[PDB]
Amino acid sequence: ADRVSSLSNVSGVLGSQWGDEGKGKLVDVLAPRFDIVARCQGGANAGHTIYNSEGKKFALHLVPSGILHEGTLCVVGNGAVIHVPGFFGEIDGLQSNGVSCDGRILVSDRAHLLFDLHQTVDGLREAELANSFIGTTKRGIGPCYSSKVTRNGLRVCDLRHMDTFGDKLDVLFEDAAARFEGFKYSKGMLKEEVERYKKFAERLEPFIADTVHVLNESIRQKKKILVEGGQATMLDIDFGTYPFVTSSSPSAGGICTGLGIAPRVIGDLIGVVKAYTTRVGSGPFPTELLGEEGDVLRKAGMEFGTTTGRPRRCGWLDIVALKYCCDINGFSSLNLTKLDVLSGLPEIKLGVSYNQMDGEKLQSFPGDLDTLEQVQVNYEVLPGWDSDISSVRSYSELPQAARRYVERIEELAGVPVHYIGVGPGRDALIYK
Amino acid sequence: ADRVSSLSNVSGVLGSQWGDEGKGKLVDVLAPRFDIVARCQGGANAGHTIYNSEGKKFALHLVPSGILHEGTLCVVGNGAVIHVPGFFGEIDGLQSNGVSCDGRILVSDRAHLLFDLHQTVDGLREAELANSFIGTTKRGIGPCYSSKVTRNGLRVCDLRHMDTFGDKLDVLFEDAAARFEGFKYSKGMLKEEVERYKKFAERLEPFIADTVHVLNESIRQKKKILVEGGQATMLDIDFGTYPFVTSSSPSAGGICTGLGIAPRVIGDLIGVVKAYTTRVGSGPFPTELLGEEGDVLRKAGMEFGTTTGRPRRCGWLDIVALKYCCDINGFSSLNLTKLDVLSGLPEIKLGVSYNQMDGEKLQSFPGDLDTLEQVQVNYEVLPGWDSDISSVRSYSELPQAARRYVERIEELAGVPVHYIGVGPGRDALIYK
Numbered sequence: 028a029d030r031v032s033s034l035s036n037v038s039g040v041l042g043s044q045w046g047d048e049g050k051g052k053l054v055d056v057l058a059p060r061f062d063i064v065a066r067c068q069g070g071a072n073a074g075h076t077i078y079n080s081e082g083k084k085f086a087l088h089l090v091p092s093g094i095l096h097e098g099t100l101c102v103v104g105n106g107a108v109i110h111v112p113g114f115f116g117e118i119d120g121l122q123s124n125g126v127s128c129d130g131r132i133l134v135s136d137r138a139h140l141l142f143d144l145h146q147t148v149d150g151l152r153e154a155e156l157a158n159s160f161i162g163t164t165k166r167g168i169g170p171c172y173s174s175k176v177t178r179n180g181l182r183v184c185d186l187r188h189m190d191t192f193g194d195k196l197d198v199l200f201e202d203a204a205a206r207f208e209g210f211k212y213s214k215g216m217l218k219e220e221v222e223r224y225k226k227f228a229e230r231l232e233p234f235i236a237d238t239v240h241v242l243n244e245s246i247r248q249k250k251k252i253l254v255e256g257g258q259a260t261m262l263d264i265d266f267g268t269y270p271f272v273t274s275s276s277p278s279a280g281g282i283c284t285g286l287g288i289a290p291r292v293i294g295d296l297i298g299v300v301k302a303y304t305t306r307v308g309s310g311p312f313p314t315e316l317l318g319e320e321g322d323v324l325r326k327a328g329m330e331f332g333t334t335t336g337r338p339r340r341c342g343w344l345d346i347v348a349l350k351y352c353c354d355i356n357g358f359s360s361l362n363l364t365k366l367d368v369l370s371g372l373p374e375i376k377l378g379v380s381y382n383q384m385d386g387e388k389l390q391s392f393p394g395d396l397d398t399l400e401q402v403q404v405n406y407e408v409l410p411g412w413d414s415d416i417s418s419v420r421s422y423s424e425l426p427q428a429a430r431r432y433v434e435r436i437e438e439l440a441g442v443p444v445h446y447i448g449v450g451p452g453r454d455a456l457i458y459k
Numbered sequence: 460a461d462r463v464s465s466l467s468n469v470s471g472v473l474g475s476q477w478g479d480e481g482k483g484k485l486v487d488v489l490a491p492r493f494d495i496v497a498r499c500q501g502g503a504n505a506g507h508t509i510y511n512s513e514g515k516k517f518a519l520h521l522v523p524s525g526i527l528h529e530g531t532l533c534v535v536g537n538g539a540v541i542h543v544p545g546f547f548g549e550i551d552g553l554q555s556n557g558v559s560c561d562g563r564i565l566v567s568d569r570a571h572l573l574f575d576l577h578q579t580v581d582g583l584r585e586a587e588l589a590n591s592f593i594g595t596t597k598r599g600i601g602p603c604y605s606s607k608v609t610r611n612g613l614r615v616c617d618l619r620h621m622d623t624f625g626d627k628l629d630v631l632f633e634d635a636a637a638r639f640e641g642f643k644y645s646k647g648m649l650k651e652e653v654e655r656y657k658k659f660a661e662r663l664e665p666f667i668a669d670t671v672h673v674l675n676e677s678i679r680q681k682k683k684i685l686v687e688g689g690q691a692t693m694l695d696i697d698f699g700t701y702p703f704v705t706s707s708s709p710s711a712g713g714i715c716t717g718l719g720i721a722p723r724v725i726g727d728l729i730g731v732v733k734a735y736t737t738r739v740g741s742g743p744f745p746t747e748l749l750g751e752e753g754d755v756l757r758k759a760g761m762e763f764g765t766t767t768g769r770p771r772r773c774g775w776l777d778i779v780a781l782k783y784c785c786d787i788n789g790f791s792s793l794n795l796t797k798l799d800v801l802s803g804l805p806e807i808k809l810g811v812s813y814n815q816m817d818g819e820k821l822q823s824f825p826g827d828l829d830t831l832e833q834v835q836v837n838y839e840v841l842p843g844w845d846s847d848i849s850s851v852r853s854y855s856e857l858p859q860a861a862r863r864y865v866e867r868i869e870e871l872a873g874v875p876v877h878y879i880g881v882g883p884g885r886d887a888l889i890y891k
């Protein structure tokens with residue numbers, strides 16, 4: 028079961044559901060076998076939680092999970108968005124925990140910039156909207172990618188030319204003001220922003236590097252590279268549950284557009300499938316458990332915001348969406364995480380079919396929410412088990428009902444399971 | 460030289476420079492060998508020009524170039540943006556020219572909608588800006604992709620639920636008004652838009668289909684599919700000459716995010732490289748020829764807007780950019796087009812190296828325009844020729860100086876040339 032040494036020159040870990048499946052943990056385990064670990068999409072809005080040898084907790088945002096290994100180079104691709112202030116704060120927090128970052132992190136010169144501006148703008152949007160509620164989710168991710176699409180946003184390369192940075196930054200400052208009256212843009216406030224990032228440019232300079240060239244050059248030199256997926260594909264701007272999705276492309280296609288590598292060079296793709304689904308926030312949720320069964324999962328899995336402490340909605344594993352997701356990415360294998368959370372459940376259901384409001388079986392996963400929010404899920408109950416498995420390291424040591432579980436999944440999904448998570452620890456992973 | 464039968468289950472044609480390289484022509488020639496031809500990115504803003512057997516001129520916008528073959532199904536992927544009014548106008552124009560479209564064109568339900576709104580908004584932007592000039596380029600492409608990223612835009616699936624379409628459309632109508640004072644949004648004007656697209660929904664209905672499912676299902680059934688690239692990768696939102704680029708991703712990664720297919724399933728990728736570069740509009744142009752040499756190319760190649768008649772800037776083939784582009788996409792081969800345009804030139808230069816403002820050779824293509832607009836190109840003059848080759852069908856029949864040309868290119872680029880265009884006609888293509 029040498030799964031660690033079976034991976035190709037260029038491999039990648041992708042989330043196959045919604046929210047946090049625990050990709051980081053896997054990336055941390057597989058990282059020492061790779062020369063480079065790169066984040067291709069998203070911003071610091073995410074948050075991978077990993078633990079070292081001593082059991083020390085680490086919560087990453089932008090930095091790839093491979094940062095805990097000396098011989099590994101972390102890279103933030105061009106597909107990403109960087110909130111420079113928060114970035115350095117993240118760096119400082121790692122440097123104080125004995126983890127050096129100097130010369131071990133590359134920042135794509137082609138990656139766009141997320142200013143505090145986008146953050147306040149993001150907030151202004153909801154303030155007037157139907158009123159999305161309670162949560163300091165001032166993640167200016169949406170607006171930043173918009174500036175990018177609009178082509179009026181700034182990129183990392185701009186910090187090398189502070190001369191023009193001024194008249195390049197005021198342009199989107201002026202824009203935002205024209206839109207919201209809750210923004211005045213003082214000419215004095217602009218002066219600061221320039222002098223602020225002028226200082227930031229000094230510190231960030233050694234990190235900047237031609238991400239596209241470096242990566243491609245690396246491949247020519249046979250350097251192994253593991254791509255860390257930002258979020259899940261069900262959250263994808265195109266394939267996810269629109270409009271309830273992210274403005275980024277968490278799918279496999281995104282690793283090409285976010286890193287600048289050829290689709291032909293991408294080898295194995297491990298899809299992280301949590302034993303049960305968890306959707307954070309409003310949106311369609313077929314397998315959603317509003318009853319005690321959901322409460323049991325939530326507490327056991329600790330499905331609560333790392334900052335907000337808000338409970339993530341839970342439910343049974345959705346195979347319909349998973350199968351659909353498998354096709355889109357073309358996963359070589361899968362990492363079935365948080366299996367230890369299902370312990371204690373007498374019955375564990377699986378969403379297999381999708382019926383219409385009347386009773387017609389759908390051949391594929393619904394695009395529009397109109398049809399999706401009105402579906403009749405067809406479950407498949409399986410024998411559960413009452414046994415703490417957070418200690419099982421070998422596959423054969425698992426309960427018969429638990430083994431039957433992964434097997435039924437890999438059967439319906441079509442893709443085999445090579446990793447089974449039974450604990451948050453770096454050590455808590457079973458190889459199949 | 461059975462290049463037509465060498466292509467994989469899923470192949471694709473991509474532009475490797477800027478502007479129009481003549482991808483459509485190739486797609487039209489290769490189309491009859493494929494079961495499906497699909498457009499993965501962009502909107503009607505493009506415009507592929509192809510000719511049938513009788514020599515009839517056809518100018519496509521959204522519809523893939525494979526539309527001229529009966530046993531071929533054209534597909535407009537989820538990555539695209541559809542301006543429904545213009546679409547039907549394009550359909551009507553094809554139906555009158557004896558080309559039926561009923562049941563031969565699929566429209567992705569997940570593809571976003573480009574309303575006249577985005578068109579007027581796009582215009583409002585430039586009106587107040589530094590003043591981009593003269594040109595009815597009211598292509599609301601930029602703003603539409605923005606609505607998408609913002610997640611407040613509408614998609615094709617919404618037309619199936621006109622009930623909510625109303626309150627879903629007014630949302631971005633209200634938005635635009637808040638931004639520009641040159642927009643008032645009459646409640647009466649909204650009423651129309653709803654009743655307009657309510658009628659459009661009736662006509663478009665038979666075209667709509669789950670693009671993602673269909674395509675993937677097709678692959679499972681071994682149906683060949685050829686992807687038609689929208690524009691070129693040097694125009695890519697991430698990899699192109701930002702900010703002078705399009706809001707879409709014309710690169711290979713884009714065919715994944717635009718169609719919903721696995722990166723592992725994409726086979727051959729033919730990169731269309733015109734014999735000389737042509738950049739339409741302002742932006743960095745290293746190999747730009749402002750002298751007579753440029754005028755000769757422009758007239759011979761007919762480098763003028765199909766609608767605006769404006770002359771496209773011209774120059775020598777840029778190998779630096781090409782090589783850089785080759786890596787990003789991973790082209791299996793290349794299609795060297797418009798070779799017949801180089802006839803008459805005593806000398807033909809090739810951009811090989813890139814020197815700094817002082818004299819330092821760059822290892823890679825520049826990201827920021829600051830450095831790019833200030834480079835010293837290092838050419839490589841080759842023997843030209845004075846011979847009308849618009850009649851040469853075999854490779855050996857070409858002039859020695861012309862053959863030496865393609866060979867030096869495929870040598871420096873690393874990827875072989877399999878197609879050489881010597882005329883706009885369907886028949887005017889040489890196989891190497």
Ligand SMILES: Nc1nc2c(ncn2[C@@H]2O[C@H](COP(=O)(O)OP(=O)(O)O)[C@@H](O)[C@H]2O)c(=O)[nH]1
Pocket residue numbers: 042046047048049050051052073074075076077257328364365366367368447448449450451452455
């Ligand atoms: N109990 C348990 N927790 C796990 C397991 N795998 C991962 N986790 C935890 O689940 C959370 C996963 O979300 P997070 O890592 O923030 O998101 P990611 O970006 O998808 O990695 C982390 O806090 C992990 O330490 C597992 O097998 N069992």
Ligand SMILES: Nc1nc2c(ncn2[C@@H]2O[C@H](COP(=O)(O)OP(=O)(O)O)[C@@H](O)[C@H]2O)c(=O)[nH]1
Pocket residue numbers: 474478479480481482483484505506507508509689759760796797798799800879880881882883884887
């Ligand atoms: N002279 C000449 N014209 C060509 C050749 N191949 C294509 N063209 C024409 O060049 C133009 C290329 O732009 P177009 O095809 O609209 O753009 P595309 O979107 O890249 O296909 C078209 O009008 C073609 O008919 C060639 O080998 N020689």
